[PDB]
Ligand binder design. Sequence first.
Ligand SMILES: [Cl-]
Ligand SMILES: [Cl-]
Ligand SMILES: [Cl-]
Length: 341
Amino acid sequence: QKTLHIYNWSDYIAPDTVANFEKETGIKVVYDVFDSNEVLEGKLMAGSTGFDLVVPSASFLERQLTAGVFQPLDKSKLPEWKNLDPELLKLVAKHDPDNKFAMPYMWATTGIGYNVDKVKAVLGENAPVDSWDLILKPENLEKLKSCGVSFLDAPEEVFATVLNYLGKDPNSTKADDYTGPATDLLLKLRPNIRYFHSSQYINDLANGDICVAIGWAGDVWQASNRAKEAKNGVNVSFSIPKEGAMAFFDVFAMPADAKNKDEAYQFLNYLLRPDVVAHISDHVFYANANKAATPLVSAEVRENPGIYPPADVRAKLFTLKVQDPKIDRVRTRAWTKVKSG
Ligand SMILES: [Cl-]
Ligand SMILES: [Cl-]
Ligand SMILES: [Cl-]
């Protein structure tokens, strides 16, 4: 029997996607999840992952390509490749030249999830929910400490966001930008942050246990929808702040030592069907990269400007660049100071 090992982000697939693929193809799927680019990259660099498909962010895949940990996708086994948005392909091609290694899957932004009522109770009806001031200004965060604050456990994203907020290059190659103002601000914020974590904030926003989080858009929209279906009265929203925000593109890639490559190609082409991936978007509240699928996704997802943002909001989004070894070391050490204490 055929078996296929997949390592994807958590909360990133419809409930029935895998079961439908199994019953159509007869392949048994082993499906596991992660919430951290650093965890996946560490697996890729330490040895065999034991997976046939993994899903890094494109900015991390750029770094991973030069280690040789992926093999190029045979485009002749991906006929539905045509369905992909060419403009998104061109953006991902900045990380994966000529799109040789990566199939764009979902994309979104790193912004602010928050409890509408709690934030307005603490900072007033005019709470600056359209601005990184909400969480990155120490006076505001000290007051939101009362109802719970979480940051992503995602150092490249947090530092780029802080740097942009401070008016620096989000991808500054100036070491002092990291050790000076970025670390200073983050250390001022630190005593107000309940935890650093990239998946617990979903149920904690849904449950009312935290009131504001740095989070990924569709994760926050999932939390909003979980509160709605529980009818617990918790109102969660998501903000792409006025100063801009990081955009990311999560992409399927094939490890160089993948065991069941024919089956992996069958799954990638399954995900390229417009009806298959639109249905995923319906359940996970993320924009997919499939331009033929967009009319098939539900109106409540397609028309949400925090999921499919319009041109003027997209014009304010930035993306990660790969840093040299000095900056990587400086950023990692500063993250360590921030996250342990
Ligand atoms: Cl996990
Ligand atoms: Cl007020
Ligand atoms: Cl706390």
